[PDB]
Amino acid sequence: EKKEQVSGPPLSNMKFYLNRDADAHDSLNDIDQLARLIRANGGEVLDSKPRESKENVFIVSPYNHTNLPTVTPTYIKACCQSNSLLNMENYLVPYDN
């Protein structure tokens, strides 16, 4: 692995930031800064930290299909620094629950 990002467009894909409502997790307003980098790449990310339980609050990662599950916000630090050589770190919420 020498070439940095080759398969598919390196920028502009799909992102979504919507915290559930646990009153805490990792980041809320700070992610707006770490995501500002990937937000200006060409994709789309809405840094919003709500607190309403309507099964409609989740955070989707770049190139991540199915908006049903959820991933960690720190994913950016691993997606921007590691590119995509650490999928095990998706630390996404299972499909069952």
Q: What is the DSSP string of 30-95?
A: THHHHHHHHHTTTS---EE-----SS----BPTT---SSSB--TTHHHHHHHSTTS-GGGG--B-S
With contact defined as beta carbons under 8 Å apart, do 35 and 17 qualify?
yes
For residue 89, the Cα-to-chain-centroid distance in whole angstroms is 12
Residue 18 DSSP class: E
Angle at 61 between CA 63 and CA 9, to 5 degrees: 30
Q: What is the rounded distance in angstroms from the CA atom of residue 53 to the CA atom of residue 5?
A: 37
Residue 69 DSSP class: S
Domain count, the chain: 1
Whose CA is closest to 19, among 80, 95, 93? 93
What is the span of the domain harbouring residue 1?
Answer: 1-97
Q: How was this structure determined?
A: NMR
Residue 60 DSSP class: B
With contact defined as beta carbons under 8 Å apart, do 34 and 48 qualify?
no
The stretches of the chain forming alpha helices (DSSP H) are: 31-39, 75-81
In the numeric block, which tokens belong to residue 57?
Answer: 């609050």
Location of structure tokens 């598919």: 8
- Whichever domain contains 2, its CATH number is 3.40.50.10190
